[PDB]
Amino acid sequence: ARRVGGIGRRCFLTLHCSACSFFFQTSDAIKLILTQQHHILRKKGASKFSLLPLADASLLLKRRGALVLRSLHGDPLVGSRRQRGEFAPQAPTAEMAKMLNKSCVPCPRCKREGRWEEG
């Protein structure tokens, strides 16, 4: 009756991976990149090192950490009231996939380079 995805079992918030078998929503994407900041910084080679404190695992679960994650995630599904009819929101995975692949973030399952894809 009240299933998630509608009649066609839509899924406009998940991204598939070419390697292994593991998918996650865009909500967990923000936390994954922030946690694995040491690997990204060393890959390329103070103002640059500004998000170092956010790498803490316990800080994210605190009141301050909860607000930081929500600030970056703008909830693209929500929009203006006039966006009705043909002007409906589409899957925002196109932008997320580009950043996740360019940043060269390892997958939790298996340590690999950019292997993410839209799905």
Binding site: V4, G5, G6, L13, T14
Partner: peptide
């Protein structure tokens, strides 16, 4: 979307797009 009719429509619409929003009150 001020009343319970139009406001609840937004939450139900997002539920069909592959998201889970708490429902519960309002």
């Amino acid at each position: 979307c001020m009343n319970k009719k139009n406001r609840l429509a937004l939450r139900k619409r997002r539920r069909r797009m592959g998201e889970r929003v708490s429902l519960r009150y309002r």
